[PDB]
Amino acid sequence: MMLSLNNLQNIIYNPVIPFVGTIPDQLDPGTLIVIRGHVPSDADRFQVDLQNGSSMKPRADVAFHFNPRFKRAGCIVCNTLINEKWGREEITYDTPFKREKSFEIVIMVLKDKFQVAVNGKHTLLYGHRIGPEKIDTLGIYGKVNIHSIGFSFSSHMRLPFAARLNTPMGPGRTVVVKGEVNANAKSFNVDLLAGKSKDIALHLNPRLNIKAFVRNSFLQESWGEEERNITSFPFSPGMYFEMIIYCDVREFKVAVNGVHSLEYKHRFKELSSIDTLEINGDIHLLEVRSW
Ligand SMILES: OC[C@H]1O[C@@H](O[C@H]2[C@H](O)[C@@H](O)[C@H](O)O[C@@H]2CO)[C@H](O)[C@@H](O)[C@H]1O
C-alpha cells in the first residue's frame, strides 16, 4: 500500500523504546497509523501493540499484537492478549522486515479488521478480537529504532487543509475534491502550489457572495491577472459538489458536478514542482483524492 497524500495529524519523532503513548484520537474505521523506523543488526524481535490502557500489572489487554521476529524463516506473529491470556496465533511468513534495513508500516483500521502493508506491499489482515473503540494506547517494545509515527483520523479534513502530493504533478494527474458549501458561505479556495518556490500554480477561488469563479496564479511574490470568464457560476451556498482538477500538458481542466467549467493555461511551467494541495474557506470537506 502507498499513500497518495501526506496529511498526517499527529507526528512523533524518535520515541525511546520501550515507548508507550496515548493514541490522540479514536481508531474509527479508515484511520491510519504510519510507523517508520529500522531494525538493528542484532534484532531478535520487536513488537507494535495496540492496547486498551497502559497498566503493566495486570498487563493491559493487547487488541492487536504485531510481532516481527528475525530467524531463518522470519515472520510476523500476530495475536491478542485478554485478561493476560493470548488467543489464536496467526503467523505470516516471508517477512518484509530485515536486519539493518529501514521500513515503513502502514496500519489501516477497518470495520472488522486491521489491514497492514509494509514498504508498499500488502502484508497481512487481522480481524478485530477487541472492539477498536477500546484501543487508546500505542506500545512499542523490543529491538527496533523508531524514527516517526504519524496518524490520520476522520478529522483529517478540517480547514485549513494542507497536504503534500506524494505523486509529482504532471499531465494526466487528477485532483478531485468533494464537499458541501456552507449555508452562509462567502467563498473558499483550492490551491495547487509548488511548496518550495512559494508559488501558487493554480488558485481556484469560487466567490459566492459576488457569485464569481476567480482563478489566478501567484508567481514571483505577485498575484497575476485574474480569470473569471465562465458560462455559469457552478456553486451555491449549501450545495454538494465534486470538483475535478485535471492537469493536462497545455492547461488545467476543471469540472464541477460532472460538467466542464474552465481551462487554465499553465503559467508555472515546471509541473513536476507542484507538490502541494491546500483547501480552505466556507465549505465542509468530505473527500480529497490525488487521482
Ligand atoms: O502469542 C503471542 C506471544 O507469544 C509468546 O511466545 C509464544 C511463541 O510465539 C510460540 O511459538 C510458543 O509456542 O508459545 C509461546 C508462548 O505463548 C511471546 O513470548 C509473546 O511475546 C507473544 O509474542
Coordinates of C-alpha atoms and ligand atoms in Angstrom, one line a residue:
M1 CA 0.0 0.0 0.0
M2 CA 1.1 3.6 -0.8
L3 CA -0.3 6.9 0.3
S4 CA -1.2 9.4 -2.4
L5 CA -1.4 12.3 0.0
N6 CA 0.7 13.2 3.1
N7 CA -1.7 14.8 5.6
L8 CA -0.9 13.3 8.9
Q9 CA -2.4 14.7 12.1
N10 CA -0.1 13.8 14.9
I11 CA 3.6 13.0 14.4
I12 CA 6.1 11.8 17.0
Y13 CA 9.8 11.7 16.3
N14 CA 12.4 9.3 17.8
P15 CA 10.4 8.0 20.7
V16 CA 12.5 5.9 23.2
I17 CA 11.9 2.2 23.3
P18 CA 10.1 0.8 25.2
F19 CA 7.6 3.5 24.2
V20 CA 4.0 3.6 25.5
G21 CA 2.0 6.5 24.3
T22 CA -1.7 7.6 24.2
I23 CA -3.4 7.5 20.8
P24 CA -4.5 11.1 20.2
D25 CA -7.9 10.0 18.7
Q26 CA -10.3 7.2 18.3
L27 CA -9.4 4.5 15.8
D28 CA -12.6 4.8 13.9
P29 CA -12.6 2.9 10.5
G30 CA -10.4 4.4 7.9
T31 CA -7.8 5.6 10.4
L32 CA -4.2 5.2 9.5
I33 CA -1.0 4.7 11.7
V34 CA 2.2 5.1 9.8
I35 CA 5.3 3.8 11.5
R36 CA 8.8 4.5 10.1
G37 CA 12.0 3.0 11.5
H38 CA 14.6 0.4 11.0
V39 CA 15.7 -2.8 12.7
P40 CA 19.2 -3.0 14.3
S41 CA 21.6 -5.7 13.2
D42 CA 21.1 -7.6 16.5
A43 CA 17.3 -7.6 16.4
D44 CA 15.8 -10.8 17.8
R45 CA 12.3 -9.4 17.7
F46 CA 10.3 -6.2 18.3
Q47 CA 6.5 -5.5 18.5
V48 CA 3.9 -2.9 17.8
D49 CA 1.0 -3.3 20.2
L50 CA -2.4 -1.6 20.1
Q51 CA -3.6 -1.6 23.7
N52 CA -6.5 -0.7 25.9
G53 CA -4.7 1.3 28.5
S54 CA -1.1 1.1 29.8
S55 CA -1.2 -0.8 33.0
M56 CA 1.5 -3.4 33.4
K57 CA 0.0 -5.3 36.3
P58 CA -2.3 -6.7 35.3
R59 CA -0.7 -6.4 31.9
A60 CA -3.0 -4.2 29.8
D61 CA -5.0 -6.0 27.2
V62 CA -3.4 -6.0 23.7
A63 CA -6.1 -5.7 21.0
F64 CA -3.5 -6.1 18.2
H65 CA -0.1 -7.7 18.8
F66 CA 2.1 -7.2 15.7
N67 CA 5.4 -9.0 16.4
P68 CA 8.1 -9.3 13.7
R69 CA 10.7 -12.0 14.6
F70 CA 14.0 -12.5 12.9
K71 CA 15.1 -16.1 12.2
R72 CA 15.9 -18.5 9.4
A73 CA 12.3 -18.2 8.2
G74 CA 11.5 -14.7 9.5
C75 CA 7.9 -13.9 10.2
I76 CA 5.3 -11.7 11.9
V77 CA 3.4 -13.2 14.8
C78 CA 0.1 -11.6 15.5
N79 CA -2.2 -12.3 18.4
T80 CA -4.4 -10.7 21.1
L81 CA -4.0 -10.6 24.9
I82 CA -7.1 -10.6 27.1
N83 CA -7.1 -10.8 30.8
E84 CA -3.4 -11.8 30.4
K85 CA -4.2 -14.6 28.0
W86 CA -3.1 -15.0 24.4
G87 CA -5.6 -16.1 21.8
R88 CA -5.1 -17.9 18.5
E89 CA -1.8 -17.1 17.0
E90 CA -1.6 -16.0 13.4
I91 CA 1.8 -16.2 11.7
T92 CA 2.7 -14.5 8.4
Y93 CA 5.9 -15.8 6.8
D94 CA 8.0 -14.3 4.0
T95 CA 8.5 -11.3 6.4
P96 CA 9.1 -7.9 4.7
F97 CA 11.4 -6.8 7.6
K98 CA 15.2 -7.3 7.5
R99 CA 18.1 -6.6 9.9
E100 CA 19.8 -3.3 9.1
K101 CA 17.1 -2.4 6.7
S102 CA 14.7 0.5 7.2
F103 CA 10.9 0.1 6.9
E104 CA 7.5 1.8 6.7
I105 CA 4.5 0.2 8.3
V106 CA 1.0 1.4 7.3
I107 CA -1.7 0.1 9.6
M108 CA -5.2 0.7 8.3
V109 CA -8.2 0.3 10.6
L110 CA -11.3 -1.2 9.0
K111 CA -14.7 -2.1 10.5
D112 CA -13.8 -5.8 11.2
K113 CA -10.0 -5.9 10.8
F114 CA -6.7 -4.2 10.6
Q115 CA -5.1 -4.1 7.2
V116 CA -1.3 -3.9 7.2
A117 CA 1.2 -3.1 4.5
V118 CA 4.9 -2.9 4.9
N119 CA 7.1 -0.9 2.4
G120 CA 4.2 -0.5 -0.1
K121 CA 3.2 -4.2 -0.1
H122 CA 0.2 -5.8 1.5
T123 CA 1.5 -7.8 4.4
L124 CA -1.5 -9.2 6.4
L125 CA -5.0 -8.8 7.7
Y126 CA -6.0 -9.3 11.3
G127 CA -9.6 -9.3 12.3
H128 CA -10.7 -7.4 15.4
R129 CA -11.0 -9.6 18.5
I130 CA -11.5 -6.5 20.7
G131 CA -13.7 -3.6 19.7
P132 CA -11.4 -1.0 18.1
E133 CA -13.0 1.8 20.3
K134 CA -11.4 0.1 23.3
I135 CA -7.9 0.9 22.0
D136 CA -6.3 4.0 23.4
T137 CA -2.5 3.4 23.7
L138 CA 0.3 2.5 21.3
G139 CA 3.1 0.4 22.8
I140 CA 6.3 -0.4 21.0
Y141 CA 8.9 -2.8 22.6
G142 CA 11.9 -4.8 21.6
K143 CA 14.9 -4.3 19.3
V144 CA 13.8 -1.7 16.8
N145 CA 14.6 2.0 16.2
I146 CA 11.6 4.2 15.6
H147 CA 12.0 7.4 13.6
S148 CA 8.4 8.5 13.4
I149 CA 4.9 7.5 14.0
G150 CA 2.1 9.5 12.4
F151 CA -1.7 9.4 12.3
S152 CA -4.6 10.1 10.0
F153 CA -8.1 10.3 11.6
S154 CA -11.6 11.1 10.5
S155 CA -10.7 14.7 11.3
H156 CA -8.0 14.8 8.6
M157 CA -10.3 17.1 6.6
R158 CA -10.6 20.2 8.8
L159 CA -9.7 23.5 7.4
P160 CA -7.2 24.8 6.7
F161 CA -6.4 21.7 4.8
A162 CA -2.8 21.2 3.6
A163 CA -1.4 18.1 2.0
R164 CA 1.8 17.1 0.2
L165 CA 1.5 15.3 -3.1
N166 CA 3.5 12.1 -2.9
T167 CA 2.9 11.8 -6.7
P168 CA 4.6 14.7 -8.5
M169 CA 2.2 16.9 -10.6
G170 CA 2.2 16.2 -14.3
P171 CA -0.1 15.7 -17.4
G172 CA -2.8 13.1 -16.6
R173 CA -2.8 13.8 -12.9
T174 CA -6.1 14.3 -11.3
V175 CA -7.2 16.0 -8.1
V176 CA -10.8 15.7 -7.1
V177 CA -12.5 17.4 -4.2
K178 CA -15.9 16.7 -2.8
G179 CA -17.7 18.7 -0.2
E180 CA -20.6 20.9 0.8
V181 CA -20.6 24.7 0.6
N182 CA -21.7 26.2 3.9
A183 CA -25.2 27.6 4.1
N184 CA -23.8 31.1 4.7
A185 CA -20.6 30.6 2.7
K186 CA -18.8 33.6 1.3
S187 CA -16.0 31.9 -0.6
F188 CA -13.5 29.1 -0.5
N189 CA -10.2 28.2 -2.2
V190 CA -8.4 25.2 -3.7
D191 CA -4.7 25.9 -4.5
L192 CA -2.1 23.8 -6.2
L193 CA 1.3 25.2 -5.1
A194 CA 5.0 24.5 -5.7
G195 CA 5.7 24.2 -2.0
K196 CA 9.3 25.2 -2.4
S197 CA 9.3 28.2 -4.7
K198 CA 6.4 29.6 -2.5
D199 CA 4.4 29.9 -5.7
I200 CA 0.8 29.1 -6.5
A201 CA 0.5 27.5 -9.9
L202 CA -3.3 27.3 -9.5
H203 CA -5.7 29.3 -7.4
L204 CA -9.3 28.1 -7.8
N205 CA -11.4 30.6 -5.8
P206 CA -15.2 30.4 -6.0
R207 CA -16.7 33.6 -4.5
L208 CA -20.3 33.0 -3.7
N209 CA -21.2 36.4 -2.4
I210 CA -20.4 38.1 -5.7
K211 CA -21.1 34.8 -7.5
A212 CA -17.9 34.5 -9.5
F213 CA -15.2 32.0 -10.0
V214 CA -11.8 33.5 -9.8
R215 CA -8.7 31.6 -10.8
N216 CA -5.2 33.0 -10.9
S217 CA -1.6 32.2 -10.1
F218 CA 0.7 33.8 -7.6
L219 CA 4.2 34.0 -9.1
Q220 CA 7.4 35.7 -8.0
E221 CA 5.7 37.2 -4.9
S222 CA 2.9 38.7 -7.0
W223 CA -0.7 37.9 -8.0
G224 CA -1.1 37.7 -11.7
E225 CA -4.2 38.5 -13.8
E226 CA -7.4 37.0 -12.6
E227 CA -9.5 34.8 -14.9
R228 CA -13.3 35.0 -14.3
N229 CA -14.9 34.1 -17.7
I230 CA -17.5 31.3 -17.3
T231 CA -20.7 30.1 -18.8
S232 CA -22.3 30.0 -15.3
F233 CA -21.2 30.1 -11.6
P234 CA -21.4 26.4 -10.6
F235 CA -21.5 26.9 -6.9
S236 CA -24.4 27.6 -4.5
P237 CA -24.4 28.0 -0.7
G238 CA -25.4 24.7 0.9
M239 CA -24.7 22.7 -2.3
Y240 CA -23.0 19.3 -2.6
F241 CA -20.2 19.2 -5.1
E242 CA -17.3 17.3 -6.6
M243 CA -14.7 19.3 -8.5
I244 CA -12.2 17.7 -10.8
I245 CA -8.9 19.5 -11.4
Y246 CA -7.3 17.7 -14.4
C247 CA -3.7 18.5 -15.2
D248 CA -3.1 18.5 -18.9
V249 CA 0.0 19.3 -20.9
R250 CA -1.3 22.7 -22.0
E251 CA -3.6 23.6 -19.2
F252 CA -5.7 22.6 -16.2
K253 CA -9.2 21.3 -17.0
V254 CA -11.7 21.7 -14.1
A255 CA -15.2 20.3 -13.9
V256 CA -17.9 20.6 -11.3
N257 CA -20.6 18.0 -10.6
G258 CA -19.9 16.3 -13.9
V259 CA -19.6 19.4 -16.1
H260 CA -16.6 21.1 -17.6
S261 CA -16.2 24.6 -16.1
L262 CA -13.0 26.0 -17.2
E263 CA -9.5 25.6 -18.6
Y264 CA -6.4 27.4 -17.2
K265 CA -3.3 27.8 -19.4
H266 CA -0.3 26.8 -17.3
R267 CA 1.6 29.8 -16.0
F268 CA 4.0 27.9 -13.9
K269 CA 5.7 25.6 -16.4
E270 CA 7.6 23.2 -14.1
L271 CA 4.6 21.0 -13.4
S272 CA 6.7 18.4 -11.6
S273 CA 7.3 21.1 -8.9
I274 CA 3.6 21.4 -8.0
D275 CA 3.8 19.3 -4.9
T276 CA 1.2 20.8 -2.5
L277 CA -2.5 21.0 -2.2
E278 CA -4.3 23.4 0.1
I279 CA -8.0 23.8 0.8
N280 CA -9.7 26.4 2.9
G281 CA -12.8 28.6 3.0
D282 CA -16.5 28.2 3.7
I283 CA -17.0 24.5 2.9
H284 CA -17.3 21.2 4.7
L285 CA -14.6 19.0 3.2
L286 CA -15.8 15.5 2.5
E287 CA -13.2 13.9 0.3
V288 CA -9.9 14.7 -1.4
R289 CA -8.3 12.3 -3.9
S290 CA -4.9 12.8 -5.7
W291 CA -6.2 10.6 -8.6
Ligands
LIG1 O1 1.3 -15.5 21.1 C1 2.0 -14.2 21.2 C2 3.0 -14.3 22.3 O2 3.8 -15.5 22.0 C3 4.8 -15.7 23.1 O3 5.6 -16.8 22.7 C4 4.9 -18.0 22.2 C5 5.5 -18.4 20.9 O4 5.2 -17.4 19.9 C6 5.1 -19.8 20.4 O5 6.0 -20.2 19.4 C7 5.2 -20.8 21.5 O6 4.6 -22.0 21.1 O7 4.4 -20.3 22.7 C8 4.9 -19.1 23.2 C9 4.1 -18.8 24.5 O8 3.0 -18.0 24.2 C10 5.7 -14.5 23.2 O9 6.7 -14.7 24.2 C11 4.9 -13.2 23.4 O10 5.8 -12.1 23.5 C12 3.9 -13.0 22.3 O11 4.6 -12.9 21.1

